[PDB]
Design a protein around this ligand. Structure first.
Ligand SMILES: [Ca+2]
Ligand SMILES: [Ca+2]
Ligand SMILES: [Ca+2]
Ligand SMILES: [Ca+2]
Ligand SMILES: [Ca+2]
Lengths: 619, 148, 647
């Protein structure tokens, strides 16, 4: 019961207005009530509301100009008074007039020496999905979000700075990105920079980080505000000559590479959770960058790397299919021929030249198993645990399979030193998950592998919520069959000789694999025939064929949102490969600078065609 | 014809081709005469030279397409000047003929999806087509864009 | 690596501007600076740029009029100076002012007797996918593409001929077809032909080939500039009488037939790689033509051809199922009953009257197989190897099957003469590929075979990319089963007694074919049930049904671009049938001329019914005139609106 108390308090605000004679006269513009009640009687006008009101706030809140002017005389000091506590802390009456976008009360309040640095630190202003808005803390920031120019111009001209910060360290620039109205707030961003008159030694207001260290450029990259990203790009590109329909631009390439430790754009984009931020990669100075980092310098190191893992798994299976085996030892088949097995796993036999070769490749797998683990030690000692799941889902959700591959290789190394019995079960998981993990490289070789996105997209979700409705209809019917052949001799119809196999036996019928039980020579009981017919027309005609059409629908609701995933995942393949690989190979891309006397920043260039009918309509 | 747009050439070229009956590239008195009196009326064969010599810039007795184009520059299209419908028509029109066709509008909608039926595309074009050739002008397309 | 060295030279330019006092004063119109720096000191203005500029070039390139006018007084000769090396060779400043669509400096430059005959032989001017433009060479050609009429007209009045050619041999006309803005360049093509006033006795400019021998008419057909192709068709049609709403014109039909050696349109249409070039077959003198070539004289020779192929294969199978067989010779089944086979193939037994009949038909298959190779001797010896693949994919992608059919027939003709043992292994491939090769005739016999295009279209691509993700999941799990039934006795569950069959065994479980291994009488190990259900849930519940839906969506993205492939493939079938077949039957198409007093050109007439369109012709006449599922369809227009609008 957290949000209920907010509503509980909010009705309690009204009742105080309903019972105080001043405040209800403050809610309306009952001038002669306020004429008579104020000057005559001897009452204290410092009556706080339910959430800490004054009389001047209510007149401000219910847009009541002329009542506030009469309040100016009797209240020389209520201008300086803030609101009291726990939701609206410090919200003075200067703020509330700004939210109603004008009253010319700012005229009155700044005539009444109102402070412009009182900070609204209340609960209902912090950035949260509980509140429906976010307006910062300072009264300048209130005027900025409602897009009201002449109030903003007024506030600079009375001594308001433009460099205040919130609890999160956000400037007034950062607030404009988080507004939901995009194009109607882009104009404000140019206006406030015009009042950056003082050339400061520290930074020129555009490089100010927050408490998690973000320039307003990068924060717009995080939130996917494309139109704002497009407009701030304009001040960093630098145009060279133009030649008819050609144009030679020169993008800046400073805060968008992985040069610094800040990582500054691209690790910030792929580690988002929001969907819309992946749209940024289609913009012009970025899409050109990663296409150069992949067509050159990314693809051959990747495919040469994926060839190495392919030679690893082959070396594993060769030292898998040759195992030290012997014939069965002295224990003959003691159950009555329900016990057929014949080999049992040699103890300490190595004395062949053949086993020397097998010893070599077996050590190759073990040394490789250690290498996988030591890479992943600094990974999950820093990036939490569920924080790693936030890294996981997008483009690298295998990343534990290669971990659980390594545990199974270690256990079978531990197993043969102990020389214990059940050594076939760790070899099993270490063999499927080995070959399944090469599907990680389906991003490569061409765009002939985005299946590994879609098969991921469908093994979760679509199969998974279909699996339970399998798992109950099988659970009755299999249990129904174990009763119905309880009487019978299992020498015929060995499908159902006991309950635990009868589930798995029924499971083969649900997917149309086993042939379906029949004997034709012994009359099987008369309740089977009705029941098993009822099984088929649910399972292999209604239930399964539902899954194809349900699969058939979901294939083309993700037509568009499949292809951009693939080009997103290459970026995730790129930067991870850049981060773990040292230099003196595939250098920091783009053209180096300051040899041309241009700056320490590095650059790259793009040509294009204007399609000059746009020039020709430009009348 | 100081400045024009591609569509304005292409549609008027279709007009000039439809108006030129023998495809000689010129317009004579005999040619303009019959098609005008095809439409109900009849000019009394003296207006015809008074039609041509009003507009014949060189006085050669013929109306070539540039003289035809600068005449339509004086009978200029209205103030329907935009920028996005201009861009929207370029993405739609593959070959750039100036007339978005049936199969082209099927093609662009297919890449967006929604599975339009063949009859459903014919219901789109026939209502949008003002003059009735089964093809949408640039002028016809903006009237579906702005309001209904 | 090559693109950076182009780019690095470009940044290398700007440093030369930022260090020179002259050219930086030439980038701006700093006339106060430009006046004092030139006339006072003693410094030459021959300061070459990094890509070999002159100071006169820079004012044009940064479009600065009033600076270069001052430069004319100091520099009488630098108009004649070209640019230096390796990207912009021979580019004079007359080019650069033209590309800026005016400067009224062409006034001043031609006042300084500037040559109009300079050639820009540089690197970045050649036609290439590296460059983004193609303006040709000559300054007349540069004015052609930016569509500036008076700038063109001014150049004819200074002795600029129109018959310049590039290294490709293209005229100025051929440049205009390759320009991407199509109808806005259609007008220039009429303007330049008006300046062919001197009818030269060679050819009147519209017939000049390039270095690969192409008219400007044919060139639009190769590149699919249909609107330009529509316009050049207009000068060839020759209309007869009109009758109310009827019209009977007479199309030209000279450069679109397979009469000459030039092959003239149709082979050049099908041999391209470009997809949009196939569109020309919808246009009016062509679509009408190939229908007449097909319904008359094209279909009935084609169907009568294929039936001879049908009796060929039938004759092969009869001499396939009858082979000389003996019972098994003296060697008994020496492995312990794991070696059941019983005949081993008679050695030199023909001495029967019955097998002489078999001797007849077995020769005929050999005789026909030689003929197949005799057709395909010149084809491999001329049309490269990758060049043969360009022929392959569009309309003839079988064409090696019929080659390999000719191999294996000649193998089994060798194989019985030496009379070695392994004669069955060619006889398999020489049999299935034979019956599959009759599917070549699915184009004909009606339009009830465009499948063979889609089954081509889908066996590559879709099934091909699906085969790998089979081939690894099966490769682990088959290797998984061999480990767990390694311990077992294969007298029960004889699926997995050895490794290479276990892959083949697993392959049948993946496609829901074999029964699924179970015994119900002997207990199988406890790792089987965990592995197998995990195999079943991927292979025949997740992976395979994913194939159908992935096959589902790709059926109707290509519903439209399938049917025109069929109608394209008839034309490609038609011409190949014409070329390798002599005349004195199915005569040269269309109607012959010059008996009617017209000329050696051959023609065909087309009747058509126009419409009136009464509501459109009123507003043009008044321009002369002196002083349902409607709500369903409109919601799609709204869906067209909302998806496009800004978002
Ligand atoms: Ca079966
Ligand atoms: Ca005419
Ligand atoms: Ca005229
Ligand atoms: Ca079109
Ligand atoms: Ca129309």
């Amino acid at each position: 019961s957290w949000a209920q108390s907010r509503d509980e308090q909010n009705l309690l605000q009204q009742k105080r207005i309903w019972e105080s004679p001043l405040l209800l006269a403050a809610k309306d513009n009952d001038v002669q009530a306020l004429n008579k009640l104020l000057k005559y009687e001897d009452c204290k006008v410092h009556q706080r509301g339910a959430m800490g009101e004054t009389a001047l706030h209510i007149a401000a809140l219910y847009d009541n100009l002329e009542a506030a002017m009469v309040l100016m005389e009797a209240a020389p000091e209520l201008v300086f008074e803030p609101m009291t506590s726990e939701l609206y802390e410090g919200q003075t009456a200067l703020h509330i007039a700004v939210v109603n976008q004008n009253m010319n009360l700012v005229r009155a309040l700044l005539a009444r020496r109102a402070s412009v640095s009182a900070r609204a630190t209340g609960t209902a202003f912090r950035r949260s999905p509980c509140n429906l808005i976010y307006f910062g803390e300072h009264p300048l920031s209130f005027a900025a979000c409602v897009n009201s120019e002449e109030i903003v111009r007024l506030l600079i001209e009375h001594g308001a700075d433009i460099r205040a910060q919130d609890s999160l360290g956000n400037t007034v620039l950062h607030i404009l990105i988080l507004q939901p109205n995009k194009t109607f707030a882009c104009q404000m961003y140019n206006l406030l920079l015009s009042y950056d008159r003082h050339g400061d030694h520290l930074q020129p207001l555009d490089l100010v980080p927050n408490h998690q260290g973000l320039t307003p450029f990068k924060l717009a990259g995080v939130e996917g505000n494309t139109v704002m990203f497009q407009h701030l790009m304009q001040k960093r590109k630098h145009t060279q000559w133009t030649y008819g329909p050609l144009t030679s631009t020169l993008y800046d390439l400073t805060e968008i590479d992985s040069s610094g430790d800040e990582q500054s754009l691209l690790e910030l984009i792929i580690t988002t959770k929001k969907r819309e931020a992946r749209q940024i990669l289609d913009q012009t100075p970025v899409k050109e960058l990663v296409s150069l980092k992949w067509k050159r310098y990314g693809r051959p190191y990747f495919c040469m790397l994926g060839a190495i893992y392919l030679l690893y798994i082959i070396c594993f299976t060769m030292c898998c299919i040759y195992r030290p085996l012997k014939p069965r030892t002295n224990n003959r088949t003691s159950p009555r021929d329900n016990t057929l097995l014949q080999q049992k796993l040699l103890q300490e036999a190595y004395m062949t030249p053949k086993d020397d070769i097998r010893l070599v490749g077996e050590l190759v797998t073990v040394i490789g198993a250690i290498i996988i683990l030591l890479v992943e030690v600094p990974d999950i000692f820093r990036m939490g645990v569920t924080r790693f799941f936030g890294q996981t889902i997008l483009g690298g959700p295998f990343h534990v399979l290669i971990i659980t591959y390594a545990f199974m290789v270690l256990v079978t190394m531990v197993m043969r030193l102990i020389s214990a019995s059940g050594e076939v079960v760790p070899m099993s998981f270490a063999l499927v998950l080995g070959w399944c993990n090469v599907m990680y490289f389906a991003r490569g070789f061409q765009m002939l592998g985005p299946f590994t996105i879609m098969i991921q997209k469908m093994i979760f979700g679509d199969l998974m919520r279909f699996c339970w409705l399998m798992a109950v209809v099988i659970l009755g019917f299999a249990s129904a069959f174990y009763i119905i052949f309880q009487t019978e001799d299992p020498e015929e119809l060995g499908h159902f000789y006991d309950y635990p196999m009868a589930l798995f036996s029924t499971f083969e019928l649900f997917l149309t694999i086993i042939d379906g039980p029949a004997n034709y020579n012994v009359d099987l009981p008369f309740m089977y025939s009705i029941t098993y017919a009822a099984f088929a027309i649910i399972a292999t005609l209604l239930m399964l064929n539902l899954l194809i059409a349900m699969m058939g629908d979901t294939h083309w609701r993700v037509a568009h949102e499949r292809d951009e995933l693939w080009r997103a995942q290459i970026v995730a393949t790129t930067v991870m490969l850049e981060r773990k690989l040292p230099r003196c190979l595939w250098p920091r891309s783009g053209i180096c600078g300051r040899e041309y006397g241009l700056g320490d920043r590095w650059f790259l260039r793009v040509e294009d065609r204007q399609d000059l009918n746009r020039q020709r309509i430009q009348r | 014809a100081d400045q024009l747009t591609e569509e304005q050439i292409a549609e008027f070229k279709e007009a000039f081709s439809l108006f030129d009956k023998d495809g000689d590239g010129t317009i004579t008195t005999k040619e303009l005469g019959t098609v005008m009196r095809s439409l109900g009326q009849n000019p009394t064969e003296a207006e015809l030279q008074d039609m041509i010599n009003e507009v014949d810039a060189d006085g050669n007795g013929t109306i070539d397409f540039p003289e035809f184009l600068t005449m339509m520059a004086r009978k200029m299209k209205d103030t329907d000047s935009e920028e996005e419908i201009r861009e929207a028509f370029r993405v739609f029109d593959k070959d750039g003929n100036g007339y978005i066709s049936a199969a082209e509008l099927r093609h662009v909608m297919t890449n967006l999806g929604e599975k339009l039926t063949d009859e459903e595309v014919d219901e789109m074009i026939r209502e949008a087509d003002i003059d009735g050739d089964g093809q949408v002008n640039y002028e016809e397309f903006v009237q579906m864009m702005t309001a209904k």
